[PDB]
Amino acid sequence: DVSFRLSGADPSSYGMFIKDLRNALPHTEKVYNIPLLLPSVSGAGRYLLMHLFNYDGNTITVAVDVTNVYIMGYLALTTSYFFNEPAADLASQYVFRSARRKITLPYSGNYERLQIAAGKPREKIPIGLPALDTAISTLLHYDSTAAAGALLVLIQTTAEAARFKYIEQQIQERAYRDEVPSSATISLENSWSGLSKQIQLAQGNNGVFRTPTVLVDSKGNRVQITNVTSNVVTSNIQLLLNTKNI
Ligand SMILES: Nc1ccn([C@@H]2O[C@H](COP(=O)(O)OP(=O)(O)OP(=O)(O)O)[C@@H](O)[C@H]2O)c(=O)n1
Ligand SMILES: *[C@@H]1O[C@H](CO)[C@@H](O)[C@H](O)[C@H]1NC(C)=O
């Protein structure tokens, strides 16, 4: 398992957590020196548990699919909560089985559906360590509309930060003040699958992407990524979604 405590948290301890999260994801191969997530894992080994504690020391445990870093569900006290999707229903066969009851959330875990449930795009939702503290607190007691917003914060401050060093850094910058994600952050989130695929396709193509990936950069400028020499590949991305899952 991995853990993170908001009480006394700072950019360093958050960085240690994101490092722990990355290191808990199994891989047998690196592609251009980036860990390649496994095609599949059978049984309970498929799910990583993240123990997150809010400032007051209350806790949820979040179940993460180690093949794609997707959040499947979470446990809050004696109630488990899972997304309304087959991958999460499958996960519910393995994690949080001792929960006294199981609630299936009234949406799947994908950004589009969460944003609709939340009533706002995540362009407009501040993220940061304070926002994560709020998210944990919200998820402690069931409220599906509020939970959608909390889950958008949670996904971005855990999974997306694990996937991209830039996003980790953005959260570290928001250690004591929330701020809506940069357009570059949004872009990277949306492009993780595409980037993962193209980095893998570059292996037998002299490091060249078969199809360019369009990103928005730090300055808000839309740019094309065409090969593995780009800083996004060398610097930024920390985990690759296996093409067998794309
Ligand atoms: N059960 C799930 C489902 C999705 N995700 C998150 O959402 C992504 C997968 O679907 P996503 O692209 O978010 O959904 P879309 O609706 O396609 O998002 P958008 O339309 O905003 O691009 C993953 O990378 C992951 O970060 C998750 O954490 N847990
Ligand atoms: C590869 O990407 C680099 C850096 O972004 C760019 O300058 C260059 O034109 C690209 N080279 C090829 C061969 O595609």
Side-chain angles (χ1 to χ4, degrees):
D1 303 1
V2 294
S3 292
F4 182 53
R5 293 173 167 77
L6 275 293
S7 192
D10 68 348
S12 184
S13 75
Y14 174 72
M16 294 193 266
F17 158 65
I18 295 303
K19 173 205 276 181
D20 290 348
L21 175 46
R22 287 167 186 151
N23 289 163
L25 304 175
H27 70 274
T28 46
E29 209 180 323
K30 299 189 181 177
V31 177
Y32 293 101
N33 207 41
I34 307 146
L36 173 68
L37 296 173
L38 299 174
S40 59
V41 176
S42 289
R46 190 172 186 101
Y47 311 104
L48 170 61
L49 305 186
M50 306 194 292
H51 306 284
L52 305 173
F53 301 74
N54 73 4
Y55 179 85
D56 295 333
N58 291 333
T59 189
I60 64 171
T61 300
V62 182
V64 179
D65 183 327
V66 305
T67 69
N68 52 26
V69 211
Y70 288 18
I71 291 170
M72 295 296 98
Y74 56 96
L75 176 66
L77 182 37
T78 63
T79 304
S80 62
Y81 301 87
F82 294 90
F83 287 121
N84 193 198
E85 73 204 25
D89 175 30
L90 171 57
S92 79
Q93 299 176 37
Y94 299 97
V95 296
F96 316 141
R97 292 274 308 273
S98 52
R100 292 186 69 245
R101 56 164 188 179
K102 177 171 79 184
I103 291 172
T104 304
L105 298 168
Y107 35 75
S108 67
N110 68 276
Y111 282 136
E112 153 198 51
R113 296 296 176 185
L114 286 169
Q115 286 176 171
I116 286 174
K120 42 176 70 180
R122 69 206 193 275
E123 278 81 345
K124 303 275 271 289
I125 303 173
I127 59 179
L129 296 184
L132 181 51
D133 189 39
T134 307
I136 294 159
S137 298
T138 291
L139 297 176
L140 290 164
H141 301 106
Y142 180 59
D143 178 329
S144 70
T145 299
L151 287 162
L152 287 169
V153 171
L154 172 72
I155 287 163
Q156 293 180 275
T157 58
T158 61
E160 301 289 15
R163 289 164 180 158
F164 296 101
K165 192 154 279 176
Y166 171 84
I167 294 179
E168 171 183 12
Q169 289 166 342
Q170 290 292 109
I171 305 311
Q172 288 173 313
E173 292 182 0
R174 298 156 164 72
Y176 318 112
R177 181 185 62 190
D178 293 328
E179 181 179 338
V180 292
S182 56
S183 306
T185 293
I186 297 302
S187 183
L188 291 161
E189 293 170 357
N190 294 341
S191 303
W192 183 59
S193 186
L195 283 169
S196 295
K197 187 186 196 193
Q198 292 305 319
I199 290 163
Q200 281 160 94
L201 294 178
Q203 294 178 88
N205 193 220
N206 296 312
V208 178
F209 286 13
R210 294 277 175 190
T211 307
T213 292
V214 184
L215 298 185
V216 185
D217 74 4
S218 301
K219 318 250 182 203
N221 292 313
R222 156 252 170 262
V223 298
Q224 282 210 337
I225 312 301
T226 59
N227 65 74
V228 299
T229 71
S230 164
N231 283 311
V232 189
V233 182
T234 65
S235 315
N236 199 346
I237 194 159
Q238 302 294 311
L239 303 166
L240 301 174
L241 183 59
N242 203 288
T243 44
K244 293 170 78 174
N245 295 312
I246 308 175

